Design a protein around this nucleic acid. Structure first.
Length: 63
DNA sequence: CCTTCTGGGGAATTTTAAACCGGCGATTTTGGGGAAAAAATAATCGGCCTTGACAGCTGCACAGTAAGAGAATTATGCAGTGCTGCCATAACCATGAGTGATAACACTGCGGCCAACT
């Protein structure tokens, strides 16, 4: 979940010719994570989750 | 008057410094698996801050359009009646097939009789 700026920085510094491992060191990210993000379309910073059960569900129709 | 010393130059050789390229040893990095920790997200909890309402109640008036409710009128479909013709059914006889009936034995249902308890 590296933010827009983090992903932009990773992609740019990698494409400039800078080595990937020291890129990860500089940005404080795991080498596997950085390498995976190298070949990625756009910055991933969103997680989608659907609704979940609550306590007032059985009573909701009655209310 | 003569001899010896020295110096310059061209060629041959040697050594050391520098740079490249290859080989060898070390660390790094990538990938996968397992555990631990952090953070993010959602849900649930308590509580503070702020304000609306409760103060008789709302039914009516006008505007225009549309609908509808009741009564009178009209159209139409059903019904009723008479006369004639055609189709259906019914009546009889014959023959075949199905079912209700009859005999016999076995099992079960109902009515008459005896006994036990209150």
């Amino acid at each position: 979940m590296i933010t827009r700026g983090e992903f932009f920085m990773i992609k740019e510094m990698y494409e400039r010719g800078m080595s990937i491992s020291d890129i990860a060191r500089e940005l404080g990210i795991d080498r596997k994570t950085v390498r995976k993000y190298i070949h990625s379309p756009n910055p991933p910073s969103k997680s989608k989750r659907k609704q979940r059960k609550s306590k007032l569900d059985p009573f909701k129709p009655y209310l």
